[PDB]
Amino acid sequence: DTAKNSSPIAGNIEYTISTPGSNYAVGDKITVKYVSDDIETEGKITEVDADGKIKKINIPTAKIIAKAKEVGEYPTLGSNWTAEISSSSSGLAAVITLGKIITDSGILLAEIENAEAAMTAVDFQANLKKYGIPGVVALYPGELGDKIEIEIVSKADYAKGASALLPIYPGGGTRASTAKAVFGYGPQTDSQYAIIVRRNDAIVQSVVLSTKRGGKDIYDSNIYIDDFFAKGGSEYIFATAQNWPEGFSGILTLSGGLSSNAEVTAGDLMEAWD
């Protein structure tokens, strides 16, 4: 069929800011209802302009997806579903129109020598910005990449240790940060992020990398994201600094991994056996 690498884009809900309105604020809550009953109440406005016009929002999808599957509307959704901004907000007049649950990861990597071109392609990048997440994906295409989860902690949030409750994307909820428990040494600049890669409850990689060209670890090793990955720094994931949200901390669930039927080996099955 079609090969795809698991990404943080799949699993999100399409949205359009049909009318931006005005006087809204970041943090204003958003409710998604099904046939006029609350399903998800922890959506939020994530970007506004100077006049309070809504620019970006974030809607967690775990409860929406669970319900959609129950009622036979996954992942199309449709006109049974509505989004609204909490009545407590100062804003007015905005209209948010919901679409489907995204199943396309939006990315396929082949040889890591051409991966940066894929990672920085305009369509993929537009979706990273729209959903407010960094571009971190499974290195190899296939369903197995869905089992990779990334935990990312900024310098400011690293200092907080387990007091930092990290939001989980795109599903919702939070989880206490493990970065201070896992690393001896944390981010050294505000361009640096502790990245923990887990597969099947096991940390398979953990490293502090930078979104700033030229930044290095204590051994003068290059830790700028795109370089680190282009040079084969990971056997599990690939990433870009482009549109990495400044100060991002959070947990990324990857999905949408898909194999080309002809390319699957018995080895891939063994590796999936858990």
From Swiss-Prot:
Q: Where in the cell is it found?
A: Virion
What does this gene product do?
Structural component of the bacteriophage tail which consists of a contractile sheath, a tube and a baseplate. The central cylindrical segment of the tail consists of a rigid tube, composed of multiple copies of gp19, surrounded by the outer contractile sheath assembled from gp18 subunits. A total of 138 copies of gp18 arranged into 23 hexameric rings constitutes the sheath. During infection, contraction of the sheath drives the central tube through the host outer membrane, creating a channel for DNA ejection from the capsid into the host cell.
Question: Assembly and interactions?
Answer: Hexamer.
Family of this protein? Belongs to the myoviridae tail sheath protein family.
> What is the protein's given name?
Tail sheath protein
Query: Which lineage ranks, top first, belong to the organism behind this chain?
Result: Viruses, Duplodnaviria, Heunggongvirae, Uroviricota, Caudoviricetes
Gene name, Swiss-Prot/TrEMBL: 18
